[PDB]
């Protein structure tokens, strides 16, 4: 190893357009069916926007390289910049769905006094504001060593917090099976936790583990050879943008009917 692997430019393009046709059709189906104007379906379409931008900004950088290989610095500081703004919004959208699903169960009787539409539009537009300020600030301060400790922290505390809510919602659905089967007359919620946390770990953690070897062992012959596969830790991120329409939006029975009548 000790040299970067090469993956073809056309797999960056044939993946960035399957993700364009799925994430557009989810937003179109939410906008025209009035049963999907809940606060839960607003957080889902905020994840279809942040996945569309991260799947276009990698397609708008592959074809520039094929067509342009001190002016090109100013498009390696703007295209790179909107990638880092879309990674932060696509992570923070996944946490806002799990906190929204947590309040419908443990605050079930006073839910509509808490998650109303005036408070939804504030949070869903302040996440996108703080993911655009820090996405620009991270790129023009990339040579600092204290910026890599702010992306390592911003993944291992959104993963140790999203896993805790889905486990505590799993230990709530297990008391409700103990008091159903005794009425005279899990294995479904265990598959669900190994698809919602399994996909989020297989697709996102190989990239953020690269940034730990980058600032601690840049001379170890084992960390260097793991870091020689950086072009394969971006195909896994772009495969998350196709899986997330399948496991979140199309699980709804009313959104699958609206999706079928538009294709």
């Amino acid at each position: 190893c000790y040299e970067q692997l090469f993956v073809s430019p056309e797999v960056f393009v044939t993946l960035g357009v399957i993700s364009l046709l799925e994430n557009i059709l989810v937003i179109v189906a939410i906008a025209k069916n009035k049963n999907l104007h809940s606060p839960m379906y607003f957080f889902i379409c905020s994840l279809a926007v942040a996945d569309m931008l991260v799947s276009v900004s990698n397609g708008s950088e592959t074809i520039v390289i094929t067509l342009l290989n001190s002016f090109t610095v100013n498009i390696d500081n703007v295209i790179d910049s909107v990638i880092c703004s879309s990674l932060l919004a696509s992570i923070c959208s996944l946490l806002s769905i799990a906190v929204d699903r947590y309040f419908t169960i443990f605050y079930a009787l006073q839910y509509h006094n808490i998650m109303t539409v005036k408070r939804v539009g504030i949070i869903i537009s302040c996440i996108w504001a703080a993911c655009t300020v820090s996405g620009i600030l991270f790129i023009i301060y990339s040579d600092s060593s204290a910026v890599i400790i702010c992306l390592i922290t911003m993944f291992f505390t959104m993963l140790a917090l999203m896993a805790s809510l889905y486990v505590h919602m799993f230990l709530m659905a297990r008391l409700h099976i103990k008091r159903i089967a005794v009425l005279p007359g899990n294995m479904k919620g265990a598959i669900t936790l190994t698809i919602l946390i399994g996909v989020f770990v297989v697709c996102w953690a190989p990239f953020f583990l690269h940034l730990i070897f980058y600032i601690s062992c840049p001379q170890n012959p084992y960390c260097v050879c793991f870091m020689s596969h950086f072009n394969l830790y971006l195909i896994l991120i772009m495969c998350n943008s196709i899986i997330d329409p399948l496991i979140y939006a199309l699980r709804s029975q009313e959104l699958r009917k609206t999706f079928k009548e538009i294709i």
């Binding site: 970067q4 960056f12 990698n58 390289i65 790179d80 790129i139 690269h210 940034l211 950086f230 971006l234």
Partner: peptide
Amino acid sequence: RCXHXRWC
């Protein structure tokens, strides 16, 4: 340099 992405 870093062909795709950044910090490679």
